[PDB]
Amino acid sequence: ALKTAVHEKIMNDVVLAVKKNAEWKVLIVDQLSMRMVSACCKMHEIMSEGITLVEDINRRREPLPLLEAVYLITPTEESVKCLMADFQNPDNPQYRGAHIFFTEACPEELFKELCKSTTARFIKTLKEINIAFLPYESQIFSLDSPDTFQVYYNPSRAQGGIPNKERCAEQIATLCATLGEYPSVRYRSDFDENASFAQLVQQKLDAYRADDPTMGEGPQKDRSQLLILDRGFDPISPLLHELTFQAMAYDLLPIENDVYKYEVLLDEKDDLWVEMRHQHIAVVSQNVTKKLKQFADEKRGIKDLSQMLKKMPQYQKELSKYSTHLHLAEDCMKQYQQHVDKLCKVEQDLAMGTDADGEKIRDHMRNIVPILLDQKISAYDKIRIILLYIIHKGGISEENLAKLVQHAHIPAEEKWIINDMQNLGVPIIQDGGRRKIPQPYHTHNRKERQADHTYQMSRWTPYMKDIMEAAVEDKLDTRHYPFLNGGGKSGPRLIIFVVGGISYSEMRSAYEVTQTAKNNWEVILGSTHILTPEGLLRDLRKISNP
């Protein structure tokens, strides 16, 4: 749904918009744009429409004066510099012409320098397409901006951080503009900084609405809502070792930049991935092979292995899909059985507050310490349950934090990762002498849910989902999620943005709430960056240790 909207700006407003004939052309992109393009477009889709080669605007390349170049770059000092460079002087046109498409609004200073550039005579197309976000999935977007976390949660970063927060606001609008959405802005009152941010986003959209009246045109697009959240709105979820496929693989395995080696890329273009990603491991291997069985049975007591041997090298390209997913499920279980099982049971008690039987837990340490003193258990794993523990207790004393940092043997460098969580608004240091911090995300403060969990280690429901279901039914408390304005082939759309990242369990809830809690509503979830338990810990790291 979102994923295609981009596909269309790329294909119709760039690749096809420039094609006036059969002449070869060159696609010159930059680091971000390329990513953005990869997500929504198949390579051949573009390569069979006149583009015969893709270059990197940066690392200079061979001059082709006979072909026109199409520039899909982010309007920066660099990029715009290389651009004017390629045409830095006539009789040396790096290319025969130029079709320039800025991913987002170009700064008028460089814009000026360019319009007066030695490049002016070559520009055959000059547009701003406004696409400053990665369509990570058809329901999830990312502004690949992990540094914003620092701006929000590190004090020193307070000011000077304003242009970073103002850039985000504008990117969020590029995403709305792209869906032709002019939503109503809502934010979480309890974290004062949100308001200012909610305002930023608002302005930025106004510019788009003023520069195009049909934005948010009729089709229930007058009910859409863009709810702004701060990461401290649910510190439990992004810490838990989740067990649904995607969330669990990224957590326990080394899938860098979305590539799982033995190598493959976990993308929506996979098709099978899109069917297993949210499933619970327990049944993944089971169902992938059940799905393999229905593939082969479409060509291929005595069993005949002939057809297999026959028509097999013919499908190696497809039978490979299943292969890797079986290796993925394997890897997840190998890791689980090793040490994770034991970690989940403690985490679930802590996150829930109640045990498997629905009983309020007690005698915490009895289970915590045995983990902490296990020298074979990781440092980050220990940190995770210590925060969960504190979060549950609603704050601890300097004294006890001291006792846990000891039993776990955490380098006093990784020790501040705890203390810093406090900057997101989570209560970790008891008294504080200040006022009591509300913890909305605790089960005893959230609507009741049925105590039948089909799995004991998967009882926790992201507080995110509660927000989603309440909003989609218009039962989202304005006392905590006010409108900055007060009151408040279609949508309505619930655009939720979290400054501070999002977990796979939340991305999983966006689909859940959508593929059911319907009313025609479609829930789109976006964030500054995509989280991972350890990764969040790292983000927490850089505050008291840039």
TrEMBL record:
Keywords: Protein transport, Transport
One GO process term, biological-process aspect: protein transport
Source superkingdom: Eukaryota
InterPro entries: Sec-1-like_dom1, Sec-1-like_dom3a, Sec1-like, Sec1-like_dom2, Sec1-like_sf
Pfam families: Sec1
Record lineage: Eukaryota, Metazoa, Spiralia, Lophotrochozoa, Mollusca
UniProt-recorded name of the protein: Sec1-like protein
Family named by the database record: Belongs to the STXBP/unc-18/SEC1 family.
